[PDB]
A paper describes a structure:
Serine hydroxymethyltransferase (SHMT) produces 5,10-methylenetetrahydrofolate (CH2-THF) from tetrahydrofolate with serine to glycine conversion. SHMT is a potential drug target in parasites, viruses and cancer. Here, we investigated SHMT as an antibacterial target using E. faecium and (+)-SHIN-1. DLS measurements indicated that the hydrodynamic radius of efmSHMT was 4.209 nm with an evaluated molecular weight of 97.2 kDa (theoretical monomer molecular weight is 44.7 kDa), suggesting efmSHMT forms a dimer in solution.
Numbering used by the authors:
A (entry chain A): 3 to 411
B (entry chain B): 2 to 412
The structure:
Amino acid sequence: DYKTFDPDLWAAIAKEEERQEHNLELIASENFVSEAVMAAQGSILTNKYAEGYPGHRYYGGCEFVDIVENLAIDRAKELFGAKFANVQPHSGSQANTAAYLALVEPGDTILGMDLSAGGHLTHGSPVNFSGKTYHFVAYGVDPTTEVIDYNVVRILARKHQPKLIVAGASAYGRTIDFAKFREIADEVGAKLMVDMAHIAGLVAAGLHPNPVPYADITTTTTHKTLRGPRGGMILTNDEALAKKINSAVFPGIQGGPLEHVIAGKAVAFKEALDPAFKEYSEQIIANAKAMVKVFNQAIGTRVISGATDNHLMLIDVRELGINGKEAESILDSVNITVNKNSIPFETLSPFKTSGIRIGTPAITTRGFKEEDAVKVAELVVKALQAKDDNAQLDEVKTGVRELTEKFPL
Amino acid sequence: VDYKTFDPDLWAAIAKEEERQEHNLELIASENFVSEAVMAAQGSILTNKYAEGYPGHRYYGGCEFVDIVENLAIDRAKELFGAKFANVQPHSGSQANTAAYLALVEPGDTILGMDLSAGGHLTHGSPVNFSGKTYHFVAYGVDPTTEVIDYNVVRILARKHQPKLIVAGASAYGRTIDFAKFREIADEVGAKLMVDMAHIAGLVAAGLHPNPVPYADITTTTTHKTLRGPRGGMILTNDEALAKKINSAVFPGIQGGPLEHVIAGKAVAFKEALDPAFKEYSEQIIANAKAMVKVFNQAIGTRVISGATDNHLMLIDVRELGINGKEAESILDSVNITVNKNSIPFETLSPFKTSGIRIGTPAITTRGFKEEDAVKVAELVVKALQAKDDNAQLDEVKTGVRELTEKFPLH
Ligand SMILES: Cc1n[nH]c2c1[C@](c1cc(CO)cc(-c3ccccc3)c1)(C(C)C)C(C#N)=C(N)O2
Ligand SMILES: Cc1n[nH]c2c1[C@](c1cc(CO)cc(-c3ccccc3)c1)(C(C)C)C(C#N)=C(N)O2
Ligand SMILES: Cc1ncc(COP(=O)(O)O)c(CN[C@@H](CO)C(=O)O)c1O
Ligand SMILES: Cc1ncc(COP(=O)(O)O)c(CN[C@@H](CO)C(=O)O)c1O
């Protein structure tokens, strides 16, 4: 009824609802939040200005909003064991912006993971604030094993003498050894920052080593494997850093927090404390490993580094005679959503790429088990091997319909 | 009902905040009540979509319908303010201003911006904010006697300091801002002009405040103050080269994925503001504000900064009552009237004590308050602050608040 005033907007949202229902979402950074998370984001908390921190706000009327933010803060400490948490960052990018401000000065040397090797844009890309503001030096992966070589990282750190080392990634499927990163940073007198955005849910479930005890500052988003609303978060065990973090977020780089989104964070953090979340996180990894097995045994879908320890995988598609952009377009035509993605030592443009990234958090939330993840990987192989054969692409599109109807939203 | 069972802590707190919004007078000048549609958009499944890039130029697929939503927000923003280009992705007004500075100046450049005590925003050059840390801000303020901007003093400052950029706009300034004169001063010294119209955006949309968009190289705003939309930011320009720098600065410059469920809410609110009834709402905001100023002017103890309002807000120096702004804020909150303490021009107290409070009418006007009701609010505020903790008087104020909130219920 409130929809009648604006039929064009609500029609577009209606089609987006159907698109999420009918497509297989394999974008590693996406998920489906609960009804309760969306209700919190749709709450009247959007009306409240609440700059400052609980008990020390710059506006009247915040005494009940402060409960909501305290719940999000305290549940983050329960989930990750951090002594201090800041839940106001609007995004992972803002969380990383504030983390750097608390740790280094403009122009300082920072060692972070190269984008082609799997790092995030905010880990030193020259088109991002990170590369523009600080002197970033990149580390990568080994050309043959495509995993991090910690002796090479050590050599790099000693050569460049960074003030800060950043660990974490957007497209790295293997266990990150935070203990070794901390050893290297200590060796050269650098601080350590970990961006666990992609693996935060796995960390919360005990299925990836926890960076919080090792890093000066841990950042994360709330909307990937944590299955919360879109937003950021910063964690630390040092009260001196917590004060700099809090000042950097506000008044440093943000103004009013999004308290309806922070309520969604509180909701999602409590869901993550439930034992069911550990089973969900176990299923994520089992599903990713099952898919990786199919791609390892298929002709032309080369899995970067040959295995996965977490929720995602990179597929090199060069032997199929296509680039990542064409692989993404083929799979879209059969209702399978991935993203083109640079692979280690990428030689093509970042907008063409030699690969695609696939992750299992979203389909696992829909209910997919290992046999269903196997079927998904077989449909992906079939569609990419079907050199424009309309008969086989329609068979794949049929198999996708079978899966989406088997696991509705 | 069932999802609320899993988490009583969270949902009981939200229920208490619903009751507080219903039962209080919300006089925070930057707050409003958004429509059911706006909140439904924010509560939609668009929160699940990663959509980095811009409509038609995303970095990956599945964005066909998100592109429709974001283009609706862009197109209605263009129509609302008459701008040739809009960027609707900024997470907030602070992010909008961050990206606007990146499109206009280089780190270390000299910028003229309104002093915080004089009414400017933190992002207009405060040294504890990224603005004051990243650029060389020279502040202009208001005159000590009239408490309004002296444009000859701005011109003198501009000529003396040769700024690369002049910033106009305010958080706690109740008078009309003469954008034409800012453009004249910027042209004279060869500076660019940036206008942050967050507070007055809805008044501008309604033609009730001079429009900065024709005069400013870049105009920024929030969507949640007088525009009555979701919490977020927006950037406008008529220059195609600037529009490209703006888009690059927002992403991949300072943000990652946009909040498309919030952007859906921006589209909803922009169409609401395009309705003719939004003009009548905006007229009533100003008439209510002027009605309150007349009451505060007559009352001894509540000194209105500059003695008048041209827009939605007023700044009240409370020192003659023997209290500071923090004490006034907590007196009012104890009788269910919600304001914020606020520095006044040439503020002599700590920024966390302050000499004043700030009051605005957009929220109560959205509830349906007319000039008669606005007069009654101002009388209640005067009575609470003069009561010197006489509980007879304070309880009468609480009754008056309850009378008004029941006369004008939410939804
Ligand atoms: C958007 C983004 N932010 N951080 C990222 C991305 C990714 C991405 C994807 C693409 C696809 O056209 C381009 C870029 C890009 C990088 C530099 C310049 C221009 C474009 C980046 C992915 C994970 C979304 C990417 C890859 N590849 C990984 N490594 O990190
Ligand atoms: C939060 C904010 N952002 N931009 C603003 C604010 C205001 C505000 C209020 C307060 C209340 O104790 C303190 C500060 C403050 C300024 C500098 C350093 C430390 C604190 C600022 C108002 C509009 C919310 C304010 C005032 N006064 C001005 N004019 O603009
Ligand atoms: C490690 C890490 N840190 C930060 C961010 C940025 O989060 P934001 O999109 O909330 O700004 C991302 C987003 N990652 C997205 C691309 O932006 C992805 O598809 O993987 C990230 O992976
Ligand atoms: C002119 C202007 N520009 C920018 C911003 C920042 O918007 P944000 O809170 O969405 O970051 C504000 C916020 N204004 C708030 C204080 O932060 C207020 O209560 O007035 C503003 O007034």
